[PDB]
Design a protein around this nucleic acid. Structure first.
Ligand SMILES: Nc1nc2c(ncn2[C@H]2C[C@H](O)[C@@H](COP(=O)(O)OP(=O)(O)OP(=O)(O)O)O2)c(=O)[nH]1
Ligand SMILES: [Mg+2]
Ligand SMILES: [Zn+2]
Ligand SMILES: [Zn+2]
Ligand SMILES: [Zn+2]
Lengths: 49, 263, 196, 163, 65, 114, 773, 182, 134
RNA sequence: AUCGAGAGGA
């Protein structure tokens, strides 16, 4: 129940080319969980805070 | 007598601790297993729920009743239900008991194993009573009722071996150790610097002599002398748990022998 | 599953007797394999278990909060005061035979979890059931007695084996297989086959 | 680079040699430089090797280059397997890739190349150009629910009247 | 959700001990380490049965009907 | 749901005997007995006793699979000794030792207090 | 693609799988529920009518029983309802769908199925409980685990399908895999780790234990083997009773490293008929290795004989281990007081070495390498400097691990775990990367906002100095998490990019199969290869065997092949040949030895020309070395008495054999030439090991035994040839396809990205490069 | 947390003092005075920082050990140093970087990363008391564990996670050992 | 039938526990014979062997079918010895000229014996025991 | 039973 109500969804992307959105970025420190994320389908696109 | 040799160390109503000299590891072991899970006892095996308005669910309670320890002193004169020629269960092969509990007060009504009442005819034998070792005089919490909560149950105990369900185990936990100093070298001790400084010396070292670095390895010696402590739940007293242990082993060894005759 | 990504099912269930046992007379509720350990480097699993033993004895809570000055060293110190040997080990006996196990064992409390998906929810079997309407094929889902997909990836395997007839039998005598009538001149399914 | 070469005496000894490594490729003009050995010069681009040194050199390059990715990763596959891949990529005269653009074009039966990527596009132009489907390919008999020319079907069985 | 009757791993009755457990902690003001030990619960298997025990029943009764 | 009821570990099914006897083909004077609804509790105790006897040449039991309660005991005796008798002797020994134990223990129990 | 290339089908099942060590390799534990659910149409014949009626009487609710009886008319008789379900009289020609019972052939896969080894026949054992039970050694061609994998099962419905399941897709028949000319199944985990333990020189098992083990092997001849020790206490050695499971006439030799037929460190292996002579048994021996025991016993004794081998080795080792036990503590990751102090000083010495190259680079006194940035020279240095430190740390930690250390013992056995694992657990986890470079500046000019700007030091850029036993720091933890997620990404991206490689591979090689003239065509009848594999042979049969014509001194080649009859120093001692004295001299014979040696010379030049690197070990049909050892132990030949062969029986014999090796059978110029070429290489090998000097001096063959050796070589050859029908198309696609899917990760592109270029035939490629000589 | 050099007595110190902590726990113990999160925020002791403003400040990981003043137990991990002068803010506690699921893994820092990911999937599929009124609601599927147990190893986070009061997992006795090979 | 095959007296020069706990490889020199050396694996737990000891090594080949336990004391048994093993002979190496060396394996524990006058004695045979005393 | 979407499993 908890961590469902704290989920974040990012969709996909555009026309130029590149930058890697699935990857955990430095700035996530303290705001978005490093560990918690679903494996496969939408790995790193979905996040918990 | 002639072979095996016992010496009780400490003994109380719930624990027996003893040395068991001059026997084969195989036997000492088999005495363990047959204590653990082959001496028959009595315990609730069918519950018929009539009204249950508690927070705990039906099958939940039923399960909790299974576990409740029942006095099984004269359990050998009670038959198994699978054997008895009746229909389902009788007074010859089962003990039937009733529980009734209702919310009386504001303070949460409690339901104990004390509140279970024998309803079948015992015929003078010491069976079926619910065992209480509680100082407060009522043992084992069954359920809790609130303002106006009602429980009304009918439990039929039956005869069973623990092999059929862990509820009919009369044994709890059974301590077992042989050759406290590694003198038979049956184990390779895991270490970092020093073996003996790192591993702790057991209660049972004061009854055997150290190995003395100077002596070579004894290879002809085998396993003898076994330190044990047999605990009991209270359905059979300690003394008998080991006795009946020895007896049931003896019985099913014999039935092998008597089935060579019939062949 | 433990609390460390270390996941696994029950292979068999032994009873207290067949089960290995310490001198005190404890049985394990649970035996996991040592091979699931060094490859996955879940050290914390061991740590928890060492912690968890000392909390069961001491009557205290085990503090497993990440960044702290809690160290396997100080846990062992605490344990050896309590009687058992510092690194989780305990000499056990083989329940079958009674003979002391040659190697000592790492034993101790560890919080385990039960997950959804149990076997009886999973098992499914079919032998001639309900078809689809449009395809005349077996129906997805075991919820209504369906049938498993012999996809192209499983087909490629019967090819590499060279089992042709079985490749047919699964794609005709099970699943589909219909009987149509073809005209000799034009190769179409026009024919109004007035049988009987 | 370390290189095993035959000693006068007969045995193999390790010769040290200096080899030069590039970044960018225009092979038509690098080999024709005086000073180098234009019999051993290699490229990781098998597409350039095909343009310069003929189809068959490219075929060994293309293998060298497939072999290289497998081997270096620890894994070991047997030569015939890779050689079958390479050889199929090479026998139509050019470098026929394993994608809808390459292999799914090569006058093969309509039904077959249907099982892959461009499904209905194939069918349309096969209706047009009136393509006859041979029915000797696996995929065609899978579709038709008939026994494929495959091991068991490679041949035929008949009774014969004695003996 | 209730004490276990009898600890999974040993067998020993632990059901009758909960009542006394809370008394030895609250009234007598003893630490849980001695509260497990006074109740005769010597091995850890039968100690984790009671210390780790969460008693939700009390909260389940809170619901009126 | 595919669980086989627990009684099948000690209760004997339909036309199953407690013992089955079989001559061994491979070694001369050897016999392989299949004990129904039994296990280590019993196998180990007999194979141990079938070893103290100096007229037995071979002694071993195994539970083929843990899922079923059964176990196979193979015995090999010296010429002029019947194996069925070695098992008979072996069994009696066991009962004797046990009868002693029981008596020695009761003697010791009665000499205690508390 | 969805309704035709693959249809949902009938007669199928699926449950969770679990492992079963007291089960046989080619079996499969179908649960009773499923058993009763699935079926097989069986026509009533006089042979089965009794055994079959029994079943119909049993009905559909009691296991060995049946549902449905089909009549002549074809009307179905539902035995769960019906009035006449305890009546029915079976006529000859009716069909009776019965439940599956023991030893039926079923097909059993695990998806994704990127192999032929992903689909295999098993004999059914029916069993209580809900899981499909399988053999712990058939784990790896399926790549399944018991953490919760689901597996599928299919049931044939024709007699002929039952056949073309158990003759072709049968598990034993799948053991030596074609992909990689070695077996694919081995011994694993407990049995692997336990076997090492048993084989140790110190491992001595005494009477009582030994008799149970003997009894445990079902193939045991009922004959107690004689104990290696009969002093005070008769003790058998580990190696002793394990050798009971190893069949007769199995030969194995290896030589690991420090191995001198004396084995000071118990290196290597030697198995002389059945018994094992020296060396610990491990992965290299009984794993799914190339020159191993499984590769031997398969080709030698048979599949069926080898499939029962797996059984035996497990029934014994699993037993032994059940009573020896084995474990893993935290204690096994703890390392010594001085070692921990020393591990830190190692780290501390590469810390200051990174700091000093930085200080040199900050002073602009940093010489830039040819063709790279000053900044790239710095990174390149600091990474390599910290990688050396993790490995000096780890190796340091591995030297300190005792022999009784549990972790080390699995690494030694080769059961699980490897060097990296030890370093990370006890010493330090080392540097953490994302996308090649070490952890980059996310925030402006700093990695986290706990550091200052422009801080290139080791700790700020994600060198995790700490071990897992010490624990990671807040900063450290997050950096690990970065590079962690990176691998989770590809395990979810790569995995599906690779499945797309396989479809593409598969759909284009599909119809490639060798026809009945070893030609290798497609659907059209277009030739792709003129002989398959350019050599005609099936890849399962082929194995790695050395060519001793290539290496060694010109003088060392002489002292080994050359027979000069007209030289008293270089003739064949009359001790070797029966007719030794009466050959010395001669004239007509020395033409044939100048004929033979002339060829061994024309071979040696040619092999050096083909294999210019000068590599001697190559895969090749028929293992000769093993045939020659099979002669000299079969015929019990003493190395003292002279051979009864003629110098003419050897030379002219080996040339007659050559003649009937036969890959292609055309009887005209063109095909005759291809027949010559298809064998060339094999013959260079034939001529090398079957040369007059060796046949007599090195391994002393007698006329009878020598003609046998020729007989075998021919038979074993002919058997190695590829069978027309073989769909090589799929075979190779899968063979490249699968190992690709196994890959999971100095400037060049390698791996999956690289392969994607190759197959796509990319014009715009990432790392082009010449290599000029 | 805020760090200002607001010290006559010396150096750069944390705005919050022990006196503040004592008032804060005077509000826990009385469950008069009334000191909450807002009273910290309003007094100016705590300060909401978003990711863009995080770009301009320098944070300290631990209060005590990252700014006191200017032997080693070998067992404790190797931590860097101070090596920064101008701390503007400090961290409330490093372990607060984790989500709800990862908060229940004991010693995540002593344990390899991607694994700590796995636990955070399975946690959500672990089974127990999901709400105390489970009897009363009518949900398609609810699984409730017979005998929940607050684990013997806890994380401080589980305090606020209410996990201690609503477990999903019993506390098995666990042997790691090669037994039967099952 | 049954006969002795070799007899000699050796003196121990080196003792080495090569990462083991129950086994040692032992190097012994021969008395009188200046062309003879011995290397052998010996179970030091059962029969301890120290440096600078003198041992007597025999080989024999008798005093095929299962093994038989006790009742051998009721039998005649060619053993006035302490340590006794059974083995296989595998290689027969030639250290130049007239100088031969034999190799045994007692289910794992190895033996290497060097000399010359044992040419018509130690055959290429499945048998071969080993006896050490005092 | 048909479509579309989401969550998980290996
Ligand atoms: N013996 C051996 N096993 C390996 C090797 N490489 C990987 N493995 C095993 C360990 C892993 O369990 C598996 C591959 O990675 P996984 O992502 O499956 O790891 P994990 O241990 O989490 O297993 P799981 O994800 O639960 O299937 O195969 C190897 O080189 N040798
Ligand atoms: Mg898996
Ligand atoms: Zn009755
Ligand atoms: Zn028409
Ligand atoms: Zn307990």
């Amino acid at each position: 129940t908890l961590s469902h109500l704290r989920r974040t969804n990012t969709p996909i992307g555009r026309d130029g080319k590149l930058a890697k959105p699935r990857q955990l970025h430095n700035t996530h420190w303290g705001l978005v969980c490093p560990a918690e994320t679903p494996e496969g389908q939408a790995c790193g696109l979905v996040k918990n805070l | 007598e002639e072979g095996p040799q016992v010496k009780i160390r400490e003994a109380s109503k719930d624990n027996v601790d003893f040395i068991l000299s001059n026997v084969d590891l195989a036997m000492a072991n088999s005495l363990r297993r047959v204590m653990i899970a082959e001496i028959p006892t009595l315990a609730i095996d069918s519950v018929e729920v009539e009204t249950n308005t508690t927070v705990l669910a039906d099958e939940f309670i039923a399960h909790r009743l299974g576990l409740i320890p029942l006095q099984s002193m004269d359990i050998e004169q009670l038959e198994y239900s699978r054997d008895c020629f009746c229909e389902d269960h009788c007074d010859k092969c089962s003990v039937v008991l009733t529980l009734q509990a209702f919310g009386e007060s504001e303070s949460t009504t409690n339901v104990y194993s004390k509140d279970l009442v024998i309803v079948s005819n015992l015929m003078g034998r010491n069976i079926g009573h619910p065992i209480i070792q509680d100082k407060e005089g009522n043992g084992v919490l069954i359920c809790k009722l609130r303002k106006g909560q009602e429980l009304k149950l009918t439990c039929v105990a039956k005869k069973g071996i623990a092999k059929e369900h862990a509820k009919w185990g009369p044994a709890a936990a059974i301590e077992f150790e042989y050759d406290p100093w590694n003198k038979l070298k049956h184990t390779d001790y895991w270490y970092e610097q020093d073996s003996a400084k790192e591993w702790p010396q057991s209660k049972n070292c004061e009854y055997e002599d150290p190995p003395n670095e100077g002596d070579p390895f004894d290879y002809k010696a085998q396993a003898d002398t076994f330190y044990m402590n047999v605990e009991s739940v209270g359905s059979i007293p300690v003394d008998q748990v080991v006795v009946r242990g020895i007896d049931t082993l003896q019985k099913k060894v014999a039935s092998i022998l008597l089935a060579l005759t019939q062949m | 599953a433990s609390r460390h990504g270390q996941k696994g099912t029950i292979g068999i269930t032994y009873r207290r007797e067949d089960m290995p046992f310490t001198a005190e007379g404890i049985v394990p509720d649970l035996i996991i394999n040592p091979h699931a350990i060094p490859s996955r480097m879940t050290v914390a699993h061991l740590i928890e278990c060492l912690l968890s033993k000392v909390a069961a004895l001491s009557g205290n809570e085990g503090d497993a909060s990440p960044f702290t000055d809690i160290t396997v060293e100080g846990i062992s110190k605490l344990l050896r005061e309590h009687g058992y040997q510092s690194r989780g080990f305990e000499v056990m006996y083989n329940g079958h035979t009674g003979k002391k196990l040659m190697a000592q064992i790492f034993f101790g409390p560890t919080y385990y979890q039960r997950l959804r998906h149990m076997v009886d929810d999973k098992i499914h079997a079919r032998a001639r059931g309900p078809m689809q309407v449009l395809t005349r094929q077996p129906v997805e889902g075991r919820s209504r007695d369906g049938g498993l997909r012999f996809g192209e990836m499983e087909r490629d395997c019967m090819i590499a084996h060279g089992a042709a007839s079985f490749l047919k039998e699964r794609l005709m005598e099970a699943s589909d297989a219909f009987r149509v009538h073809i005209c000799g001149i034009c190769g179409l399914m026009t024919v109004i086959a007035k049988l009987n | 680079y370390d290189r095993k070469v035959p000693s006068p005496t007969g045995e193999y000894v390790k010769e040290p040699e200096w080899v030069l490594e590039t970044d960018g490729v225009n092979l038509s003009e690098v080999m024709t430089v005086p000073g180098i050995d234009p019999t051993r010069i290699y490229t990781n681009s098998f597409i350039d090797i095909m343009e310069v040194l003929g189809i068959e050199a490219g075929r060994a390059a293309l293998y060298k280059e497939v072999y290289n990715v497998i081997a270096s990763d620890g894994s070991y596959v047997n030569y015939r397997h890779m050689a079958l891949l390479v050889d199929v990529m090479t026998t139509q005269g050019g470098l026929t890739s394993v994608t809808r653009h390459g292999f799914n074009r090569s006058n093969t039966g309509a039904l077959m190349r249907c099982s892959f990527e461009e499904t209905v596009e194939i069918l349309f132009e096969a209706g047009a150009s009136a393509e006859l489907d041979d029915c000797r390919g696996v995929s065609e008999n899978v579709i038709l629910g008939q026994m494929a020319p495959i091991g068991t079907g490679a041949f035929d069985v008949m009774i014969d009247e004695e003996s | 959700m209730i004490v276990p009757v009898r600890c999974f791993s040993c067998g020993k009755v632990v059901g009758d001990k909960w009542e006394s457990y809370l008394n030895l902690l609250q009234e007598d003001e003893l630490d849980e380490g001695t509260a497990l030990s006074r109740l005769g619960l010597k091995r850890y298997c039968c100690r984790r049965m009671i210390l780790t025990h969460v008693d939700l029943i009390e909260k389940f009764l809170r619901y009126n009907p | 749901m595919n669980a086989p009821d627990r009684f099948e570990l000690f209760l004997l099914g339909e036309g199953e005997s407690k013992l089955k006897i079989d001559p061994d083909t491979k070694a001369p004077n050897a016999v392989v007995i299949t004990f129904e609804k039994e296990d280590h509790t019993l196998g180990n105790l007999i194979r141990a006793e079938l070893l103290n006897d100096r007229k037995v040449l071979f002694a071993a039991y195994k539970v083929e699979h843990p899922f079923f309660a059964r176990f196979k005991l193979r015995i090999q005796t010296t010429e002029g000794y019947d194996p069925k008798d070695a098992l008979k002797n072996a069994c009696n020994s066991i009962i004797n030792k046990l009868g002693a134990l029981k008596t020695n223990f009761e003697t010791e129990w009665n000499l205690q207090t508390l | 693609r969805g309704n035709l290339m693959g249809k949902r089908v009938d007669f199928s099942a699926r449950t969770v799988i679990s492992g079963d060590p007291n089960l046989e390799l080619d079996q499969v534990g179908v649960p009773k529920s499923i058993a009763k659910t699935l079926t097989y149409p069986e026509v009533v014949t006089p042979y089965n009518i009794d055994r079959l009626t029994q079943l119909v009487r049993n009905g559909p609710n009691e296991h060995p029983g049946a549902k449905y009886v089909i009549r002549d008319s074809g009307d179905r008789i539902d035995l769960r309802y019906s009035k006449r379900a305890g009546d029915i009289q079976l006529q000859y020609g009716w069909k009776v769908e019965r439940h599956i019972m023991d030893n039926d052939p079923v097909l059993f896969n695990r998806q994704p199925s990127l192999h032929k080894m992903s689909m295999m026949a098993h004999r059914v054992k029916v069993i209580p409980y809900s899981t499909f039970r399988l053999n712990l050694s058939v784990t790896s061609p399926y790549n399944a685990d018991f953490d919760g994998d689901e597996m599928n099962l299919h049931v044939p419905q024709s007699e002929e399908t039952r056949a073309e399941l158990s003759q072709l897709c049968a598990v034993p028949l799948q053991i030596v895999s074609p992909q990689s000319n070695k077996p694919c199944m081995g011994i694993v985990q407990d049995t692997l780790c336990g076997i090492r333990k048993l084989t140790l020189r110190d491992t001595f098992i005494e009477l009582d234990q030994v008799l149970n083990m003997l009894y445990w092997v079902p193939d045991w001849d009922g004959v107690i083997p004689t104990p290696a020790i009969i002093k005070p206490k008769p003790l058998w050695s580990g190696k002793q009773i394990l050798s009971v499971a190893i069949p007769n006439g199995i030969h194995l030799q290896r030589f690991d490293e420090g191995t001198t037929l004396l084995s000071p460190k118990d290196n290597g292996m030697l198995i002389i008929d059945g018994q094992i002579i020296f060396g610990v048994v491990e992965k290299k021996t009984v794993g799914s290795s190339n020159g191993g025991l499984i590769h031997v016993v398969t080709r030698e004794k048979g599949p069926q004989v080898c499939a029962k081998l797996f059984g035996n080795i497990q029934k014994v080792v699993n037993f032994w281990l059940l009573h020896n036990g084995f474990s893993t503590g935290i204690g096994d990751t703890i390392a010594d007081g001085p070692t921990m102090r020393e591990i830190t000083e190692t780290i501390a010495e590469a810390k200051k070495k990174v700091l000093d190259v930085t200080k040199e680079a900050q002073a602009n006194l940093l010489t830039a390498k040819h063709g790279m940035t000053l900044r790239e020279s710095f990174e390149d240095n600091v990474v390599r400097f910290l990688n050396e430190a993790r490995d000096k740390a780890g190796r340091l930690a591995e030297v300190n691990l005792k022999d009784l250390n549990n972790v080390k013992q699995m690494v030694m056995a080769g059961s699980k775990g490897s060097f990296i694992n030890i370093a990370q657990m006890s010493a330090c986890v080392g540097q953490q990367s994302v996308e090649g470079k070490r952890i980059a500046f996310g925030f402006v000019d700093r990695t986290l906002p706990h550091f200052s700007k422009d801080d290139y030091s080791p700790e700020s850029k994600g060198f995790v100095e700490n071990s897992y036993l010490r624990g990671l720091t807040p900063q450290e933890f997050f950096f690990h998490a970065m590079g962690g997620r990176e691998g989770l990404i590809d395990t979810a991206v790569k995995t599906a990019e690779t499945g797309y490689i396989q479809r593409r591979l598969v759909k284009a090689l599909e119809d490639i199969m060798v026809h009945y003239d070893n030609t290798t065509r497609n659907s059209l009848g277009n030739v792709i290869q003129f002989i398959y594999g350019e050599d005609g042979m099936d890849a399962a049969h082929i194995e790695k065997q050395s060519l001793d014509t290539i290496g060694g001194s010109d003088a060392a080649f002489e002292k080994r092949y050359r027979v000069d009859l007209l030289n008293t120093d270089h003739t064949l001692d009359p001790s070797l040949l029966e007719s030794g004295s009466e050959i010395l001299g001669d004239l007509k014979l020395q033409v044939l030895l100048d004929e033979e040696y002339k060829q061994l010379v024309k071979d040696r030049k040619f092999l050096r020309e083909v294999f210019v690197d000068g590599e001697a070990n190559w895969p090749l049909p028929v293992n000769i070395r093993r045939i020659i050892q099979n002669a000299q132990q079969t015929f019990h030949i003493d190395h003292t008495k002279p051979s009864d062969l003629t110098i003419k029986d050897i030379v002219l014999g080996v040339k007659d054999l050559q003649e009937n090796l036969l890959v292609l059978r055309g009887k005209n110029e063109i095909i005759q030439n291809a027949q010559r070429d298809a064998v060339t290489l094999f013959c260079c090998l034939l001529r090398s090991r079957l040369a007059t000097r060796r046949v007599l001096q090195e391994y002393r063959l007698t006329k009878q035994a020598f003609d046998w050796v020729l007989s075998n070589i021919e038979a074993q050859f002919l058997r190695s040839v590829v069978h027309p029908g073989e769909m090589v198309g799929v075979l190779a696609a899968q063979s490249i396809g699968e190992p690709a899917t196994q890959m999971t990760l100095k400037k060049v592109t390698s791996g999956v990205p690289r392969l994607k270029e190759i197959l796509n035939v990319a014009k715009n490629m990432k790392t082009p490069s010449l290599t000029v000589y | 947390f805020i760090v200002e050099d607001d010290e006559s007595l010396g150096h750069k110190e944390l705005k919050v003092r022990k006196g503040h902590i004592a008032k804060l726990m005077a509000t826990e113990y009385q469950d008069v005075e009334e000191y909450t999160w807002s009273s910290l925020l309003n007094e100016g002791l705590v300060e909401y920082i978003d990711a863009e403003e995080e770009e301009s400040i320098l944070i300290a990981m631990q209060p005590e050990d990252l700014e006191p003043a200017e032997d080693v137990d070998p067992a404790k991990r190797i931590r860097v140093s101070h090596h920064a002068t101008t701390f503007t803010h400090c961290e409330i506690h490093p372990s607060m970087i984790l989500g709800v699921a990862a908060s229940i893994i004991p010693f995540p820092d002593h344990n390899q990363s991607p694994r700590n990911t796995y636990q955070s999937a399975m946690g959500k599929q672990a089974m127990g008391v999901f709400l105390t009124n489970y009897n009363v609601r009518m949900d398609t599927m609810a699984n409730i564990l017979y005998y929940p147990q607050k684990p013997l190893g806890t994380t401080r986070a589980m305090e606020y996670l209410k996990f201690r009061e609503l477990p999903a997992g019993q506390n098995a006795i666990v042997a790691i050992a090669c037994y039967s090979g099952y | 039938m049954s006969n002795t095959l070799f007899d000699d007296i050796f003196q121990v020069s080196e003792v080495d526990p090569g990462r083991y706990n129950k086994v040692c490889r032992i190097e012994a020199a021969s008395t009188t014979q200046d062309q003879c050396k011995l290397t052998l694996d010996i179970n030091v737990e059962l029969f301890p062997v120290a440096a600078q000891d003198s041992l007597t090594v025999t080989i024999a080949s008798s005093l095929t079918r299962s093994w038989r336990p006790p009742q051998a004391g009721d039998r005649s048994l060619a053993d006035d010895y302490d340590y006794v093993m059974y083995g296989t002979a595998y290689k027969f190496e030639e250290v130049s000229k007239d100088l031969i060396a034999v190799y045994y394996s007692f289910g794992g524990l190895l033996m290497r014996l060097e000399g010359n006058y044992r040419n018509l004695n130690n055959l290429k045979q499945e048998n071969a025991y080993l006896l050490i005393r005092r």
